[PDB]
Structure formats: structure tokens, C-alpha cells
Design an enzyme around this catalytic site. Structure first.
Site, mmCIF file in Angstrom:
data_model
loop_
_atom_site.group_PDB
_atom_site.id
_atom_site.type_symbol
_atom_site.label_atom_id
_atom_site.label_comp_id
_atom_site.label_asym_id
_atom_site.label_seq_id
_atom_site.Cartn_x
_atom_site.Cartn_y
_atom_site.Cartn_z
ATOM 1 N N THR D 20 0.813 -1.205 0.000
ATOM 2 C CA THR D 20 0.000 0.000 0.000
ATOM 3 C C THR D 20 0.853 1.265 0.000
ATOM 4 O O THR D 20 2.013 1.279 0.417
ATOM 5 C CB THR D 20 -0.943 0.001 1.194
ATOM 6 O OG1 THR D 20 -0.190 -0.193 2.394
ATOM 7 C CG2 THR D 20 -1.965 -1.093 1.042
ATOM 8 N N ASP D 21 0.240 2.345 -0.484
ATOM 9 C CA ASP D 21 0.906 3.622 -0.689
ATOM 10 C C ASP D 21 0.854 4.517 0.529
ATOM 11 O O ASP D 21 1.525 5.550 0.545
ATOM 12 C CB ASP D 21 0.284 4.357 -1.876
ATOM 13 C CG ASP D 21 0.559 3.669 -3.186
ATOM 14 O OD1 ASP D 21 1.632 3.046 -3.314
ATOM 15 O OD2 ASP D 21 -0.309 3.725 -4.079
ATOM 16 N N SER D 46 1.825 8.873 5.128
ATOM 17 C CA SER D 46 1.317 8.734 3.770
ATOM 18 C C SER D 46 2.433 9.140 2.823
ATOM 19 O O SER D 46 2.967 10.249 2.934
ATOM 20 C CB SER D 46 0.073 9.590 3.550
ATOM 21 O OG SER D 46 -0.404 9.460 2.225
ATOM 22 N N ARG D 47 2.784 8.251 1.897
ATOM 23 C CA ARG D 47 3.926 8.483 1.018
ATOM 24 C C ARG D 47 3.670 9.518 -0.038
ATOM 25 O O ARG D 47 4.601 9.792 -0.802
ATOM 26 C CB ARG D 47 4.347 7.179 0.345
ATOM 27 C CG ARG D 47 4.883 6.136 1.294
ATOM 28 C CD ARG D 47 5.253 4.867 0.559
ATOM 29 N NE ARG D 47 5.759 3.863 1.485
ATOM 30 C CZ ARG D 47 4.994 2.969 2.098
ATOM 31 N NH1 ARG D 47 3.689 2.947 1.875
ATOM 32 N NH2 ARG D 47 5.532 2.092 2.932
ATOM 33 N N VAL D 48 2.484 10.100 -0.167
ATOM 34 C CA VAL D 48 2.263 11.153 -1.146
ATOM 35 C C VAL D 48 1.520 12.281 -0.439
ATOM 36 O O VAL D 48 1.056 13.245 -1.060
ATOM 37 C CB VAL D 48 1.502 10.591 -2.360
ATOM 38 C CG1 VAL D 48 0.036 10.342 -2.022
ATOM 39 C CG2 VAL D 48 1.736 11.438 -3.620
#
Lengths: 132, 272, 47, 183
Positions: D20-21, D46-48
Site C-alpha cells: 500500500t501507498d 502517507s507516502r504522497v
């Protein structure tokens, strides 16, 4: 000559400095001191330090209690207790406090209580004499 | 070990490590406060010691009434402070056991009476409490002087065993001579000096008591905070090392548990 | 010699009363500094 | 994913966290410590999670994330925070106000405009003088006040997508006046 090391539990004044005349302003009787002087050990009064460091400086300020000690070689230890300045004091608090001391001295009954209210009122009255 | 046991142990020592860093920073802040407070109180005390050094009156012998003033902390967790103080106190007590008799003593803090419930549990006369919580002032030293003087006791000689501050790392446990009765004072040097009447000199003597007790309390609190910061630094380092060792054994125990469970499942599916 | 010694009073009590009077002699801010520097109650333990 | 007593190192949580991102991580001591919803972060990331925001929430949440990153280091020093210096005391106080802003009642989702307003108030620091137990009551009263009176300001925030200096000046004015008339 003389090293007027003034100190108090808050801060230190002139510790290791050549001073010419210190009005040592005590309980037995306020007396000046210069460089050559007889050695002495005396307690203080609510009283009034006037320091003169070699150039006609007149710096006076107020002292609750403490101790002065000078020796043969003139090392003037003036270890005061609460040393406040004339830039630090007020008037009406001392006036109301001496009135409270007058009232409680008119109300005192015990000898230790009367002694405490007498030192309170004489601290206040020598205080106001310093104030004015 | 098991896995949950090492998880519990790592949780406990990670918390002890964080709390010990917290004690290190609290000891650092109170150390900086005690160090900036130490500058006027040092000159005050060395002036009192300088006037007693120029007036180098000796001690009369062949009398009894001695007094050891233990001044240290109430709450410990600060290293080998109270050990050195108790060592010096009982060494002076054994030296004052022979040819001295009245070694009735006063002490401050819980730790001094707590290190003196056994050897001289009779001779400790008064004890004080709540030192080292607030910074030491002059009015509490006045309370110590009133509980030494107005609670009637007379003494001629002894020592004020104070924790001496020297540096960020080091300290010193050593005494100061407490010249006590006027006869010790008014022997020859006050006869050389002037205005040495009995009442003036004994009021001077009581103020000298309050003087040296103020100096001792601020010196002891500065040494307390310095050695406590050092002890909590070293305890955080030892706790971090043991966290590292226990994390390594946690990981190898985890891998052994996974391999054991895997071999059991594979043995079952193969013997099926 | 002193009257308060004839009352039976100590010089350190004398100094503390004079300290209380001088801490009252300050106006506001120096009063706050002095009462922060004033004596916190170190408690006693008897036998 | 349910984990078994924080075991993020199991098979399925490691697989899906690698897939998952982002993750929203809920360590449970915050839940019983009384900050609900239980998203107890620091592991959560959260990677973004900066480009997926409106510019209002981007600005306010960026400053708020940096303030909480400065807060979470020093909380074990804040259990003994009373006898430390003042810079920490200010930082830890601001972090406590923000951390009790982040709690929220169940089954009542906030719109973007009002949470931008609330977290804006916490970031600009009109809360550092209030009691900790009075932050959530301020939050509910501030939602009632901003929904009732100033509808057009939330309209500005949801239509412009951001605060552009006039919402900023008006929020300075309205939060100073409502802090002047709270109690």
C-alpha cells in the site's frame, strides 16, 4: 590597602577593589572607615552603606543586617543580608507598615513579641529616614 | 527466553532510558540555575573563610561539646555524594569518639538520617527535610540557625561537612572549622582587634553560623545537580547499551520462533 | 547588651525580621525577586 | 488490518504495508489515553501526503505537522516539563493544544473548510493561554459560531481552495474577537 568586598546572598559589590572610604553604618553606631584602620568585627543595623571608591563617588544604599570585619591588612568584608538600592525602594508601603507596627506595638503583651515589634518599627523608621 | 518476556523487558528499559534522559535534562537545567546562583554565594563564603583565616584562631583542646553538621541532599539518585558524606561524618565521629564525648549532631535531608539509622542512630540530634527541592536560600538557613540555637544547645568545636562543588564532573567532601563559643574567638586575636565585647561578638558568631550554612547549602546543591546530571547521563548510556543487547536477543528469539513454527507446519504437511 | 537579647531572642531571628521589613520596603518587581529569593520552609525532624 | 498486539512485523501486515501507498496507524495507548479517533501516528505516514491536499489544508497542515514533529520528541520531557526552560514549555504547550485539537467525536465528519479554520486557529496560536480541558469546548463553540455567523468565509475557503490573505485577515479578526468573548 583595603579591599571592600561587599556581598549579599543576592549579589556581590566591589569584591576585591580599592575603595577609599566606606561609611559602615551599623547598630553600635554608624562610623566611617578608610584604608588604615583598627581591626574590628561588628554586626549591622537596618542602616545605610555609603561607599566612596577613590574618586569622590557617593553611592549610598540600604542594608537590613549582616556583618563587617576588617583586619590589620585592610580586608573589609561587609557581608550584608539584604542590600537594596535607592532605585529599589518605595514610600507608602513603609509608612503603612510603620503604622501597623505602631498598632501592634500598642497591642503587644509578651516580651519577645514586643521585642519583635520594636525591631520591626525601628527598621521601618530608620527605613523611612533613609527614604526621605 | 520467550518472545513476550523480551518485549516486556524492552518496553521497561526503553521507558527507563527516556525517563533517565528526562532526569538528565532536569538536572542540567537546575545545574545551570545553581551555577549562576553560585557566583555571589561563593564570594560571600570565601570572604567569611578569609576573615577566619587572617584571624587564624586555634582550637582549644580537652573539652567535649562538638557538632557535626551534615549538609547534603534530601532526595538522592545523584551518585556517590551521600556515601562520601557519611564516610567523612563517621570518620570524624570515630576521631571524636576518643577524647571527645558530645558528638551530638545535626543533619539535613532524608538521605543523611537514612544513612544514619544504624551506626549513630542515638547521636543525631536534629534533622531537616525538603532540602534540594527548591534552591537553597538564606531564610531557610536562618531556620537551620534558629533550630540550632533557640533549640538550646551549646557546642565548642566540630565541622560542617558540606558537599563541595568543584567542576561539572568532580566534587569534594571536606570540612570547615566552625568556631563556636566566644572563648575560642576571644583568646588572642580578638584581643589584638577592637570592639570585641561579648554580645557583639556572639551576635557576630550566630551570624557566622548563618553565613557558613548558607554557603554550605548552595555549594551542596550545586554539587548535587552536577553529580545527578552525571549519574543520569551514565545511566541513560547503560540503559541504551542494554536496550541494544536485548533488541539483538529479541530479534534472534523472533527468528527462532518463526523457524520453529515453520518446521512444525512443514513436518505436519510432510508426514500427512 | 541588646534589649532583644534580654528578651531572649536570637540574632538570626533579628536578621529575619529585618529581612521581612526590607522585603516589604521594595515596591513590586524587586519585591517579587526578593520573595523568590526569600526563605522556603525547610521542615524539621526531631527525635 | 488487525495486528496482534502491535505486531507490525507479522506476515500479512508486512505484505500489505509493502503493497500500500500509505498507512494510517492506530497505536492503542492513545485510545485509552483519551485522544479519539485513535490515529496514533509517528509510525503512521502517507507516502504522497502533501500533494493530496487543498492549499488551505496544505499550508495549515504543513505548519501543524512540523509543530507536532517538534512536540512528539519532548513529551517524555514534558512529564517533567514543569522544572525546565521556557522554550520547551511553549513548544510542548502548543503541541498539547494541537493534539487535543486533533481529537473528534465519532460519526461526525468535519468538512474541509471548518477543519481548516480550527487547525488554523491552533497553528496561529490563539489557544496557548487556554486550559487543556477547554480546548474541545472551544472547538465545538467555534464550529457553531463559524457555521452560524460566517458562512461566506467558509464559502471563500471551499471555493478559492485556499486562504488568500483576506480569509487570513478576516480570520485574524474573528478569532481575536471570539477569544475576546469566549468565557
Amino acid at each position: 590597602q583595603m579591599s571592600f568586598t561587599f556581598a549579599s546572598p543576592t549579589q556581590v559589590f566591589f569584591n576585591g577593589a580599592n575603595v577609599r572610604q566606606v561609611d559602615v553604618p551599623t547598630q553600635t553606631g554608624a562610623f566611617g572607615i578608610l584604608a588604615a584602620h583598627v581591626p574590628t568585627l561588628q554586626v549591622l543595623r537596618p542602616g545605610l552603606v555609603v561607599v566612596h571608591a577613590e574618586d569622590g563617588t557617593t553611592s549610598k544604599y540600604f542594608v537590613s543586617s549582616g556583618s563587617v570585619t576588617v583586619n590589620a591588612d585592610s580586608s573589609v568584608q561587609l557581608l550584608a543580608e539584604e542590600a537594596v538600592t535607592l532605585d529599589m525602594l518605595d514610600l507608602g508601603a513603609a509608612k503603612a507598615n510603620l503604622e501597623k507596627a505602631q498598632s501592634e506595638l500598642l497591642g503587644a503583651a509578651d516580651e519577645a513579641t514586643r521585642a519583635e515589634i520594636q525591631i520591626r518599627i525601628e527598621a521601618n523608621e530608620a527605613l523611612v529616614k533613609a527614604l526621605e | 527466553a520467550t518472545l513476550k518476556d523480551i518485549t516486556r523487558r524492552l518496553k521497561s528499559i526503553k521507558n527507563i532510558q527516556k525517563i533517565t534522559k528526562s532526569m538528565k535534562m532536569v538536572a542540567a537545567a537546575k545545574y545551570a540555575r545553581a551555577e549562576r546562583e553560585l557566583k555571589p554565594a561563593r564570594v560571600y563564603g570565601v570572604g567569611s573563610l578569609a576573615l577566619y583565616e587572617k584571624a587564624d584562631i586555634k582550637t582549644p583542646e580537652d573539652k567535649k561539646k562538638h557538632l557535626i553538621i551534615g549538609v547534603s541532599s534530601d532526595r538522592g539518585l545523584c551518585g556517590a555524594i551521600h556515601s562520601s558524606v557519611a564516610k567523612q561524618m563517621k570518620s570524624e565521629a570515630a576521631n571524636l569518639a576518643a577524647a571527645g564525648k558530645e558528638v551530638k549532631i545535626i543533619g539535613v535531608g532524608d538521605k543523611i538520617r537514612s544513612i544514619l539509622h544504624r551506626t549513630h542512630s542515638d547521636q543525631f540530634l536534629v534533622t531537616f527535610k525538603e532540602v534540594g527541592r527548591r534552591p537553597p536560600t538564606f531564610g531557610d538557613a536562618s531556620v537551620i540557625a534558629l533550630e540550632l540555637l533557640n533549640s538550646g544547645y551549646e557546642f565548642d568545636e566540630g565541622s560542617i561537612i558540606f558537599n563541595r562543588f568543584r567542576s561539572v564532573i568532580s566534587y569534594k567532601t571536606e570540612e570547615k572549622p566552625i568556631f563556636s563559643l566566644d572563648t575560642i574567638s576571644s583568646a588572642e586575636s580578638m584581643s589584638i582587634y577592637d570592639d570585641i565585647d561579648a554580645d557583639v561578638l556572639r551576635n557576630y558568631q550566630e551570624y557566622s553560623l548563618a553565613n557558613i550554612i548558607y554557603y554550605s547549602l548552595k555549594e551542596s546543591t550545586t554539587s548535587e545537580q552536577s553529580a545527578r546530571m552525571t549519574a543520569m547521563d551514565n545511566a541513560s548510556k547503560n540503559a541504551s547499551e542494554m536496550i541494544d543487547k536485548l533488541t539483538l536477543t529479541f530479534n534472534r528469539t523472533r527468528q527462532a520462533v518463526i523457524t520453529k513454527e515453520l518446521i512444525e507446519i512443514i513436518s505436519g504437511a510432510a508426514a500427512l | 547588651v541588646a534589649y532583644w537579647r534580654q528578651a531572649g531572642l536570637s540574632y538570626i531571628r533579628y536578621s529575619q525580621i529585618c529581612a521581612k521589613a526590607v522585603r516589604d520596603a521594595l515596591k513590586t518587581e524587586f519585591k517579587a525577586n526578593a520573595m523568590k529569593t526569600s526563605g522556603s520552609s525547610i521542615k524539621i525532624v526531631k527525635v | 488490518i488487525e495486528t496482534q498486539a502491535g505486531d507490525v512485523s507479522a506476515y500479512i501486515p508486512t505484505n500489505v504495508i509493502s503493497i500500500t501507498d500509505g498507512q494510517i496507524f492506530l497505536e492503542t495507548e492513545l485510545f485509552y489515553k483519551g485522544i479519539r479517533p485513535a490515529i496514533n501516528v509517528g509510525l503512521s505516514v502517507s507516502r504522497v501526503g502533501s500533494a493530496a491536499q487543498t492549499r488551505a489544508m496544505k499550508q495549515v497542515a504543513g505548519t501543524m505537522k512540523l509543530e507536532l514533529a517538534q512536540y512528539r520528541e519532548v513529551a517524555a520531557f514534558a512529564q517533567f516539563g514543569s522544572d525546565l526552560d521556557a522554550a520547551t514549555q511553549q513548544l510542548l504547550s502548543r503541541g498539547v493544544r494541537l493534539t487535543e485539537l486533533l481529537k473528534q467525536g465519532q460519526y461526525s465528519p468535519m468538512a474541509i473548510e471548518e477543519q481548516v479554520a480550527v487547525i488554523y486557529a491552533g497553528v496561529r496560536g490563539y489557544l496557548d493561554k487556554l486550559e487543556p480541558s477547554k480546548i474541545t469546548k472551544f472547538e465545538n463553540a467555534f464550529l457553531s459560531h463559524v457555521i452560524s455567523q460566517h458562512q461566506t468565509l467558509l464559502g471563500k475557503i471551499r471555493t478559492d481552495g485556499k486562504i488568500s490573505e483576506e480569509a487570513d485577515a478576516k480570520l485574524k479578526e474573528i478569532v481575536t474577537n471570539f477569544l475576546a468573548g469566549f468565557e
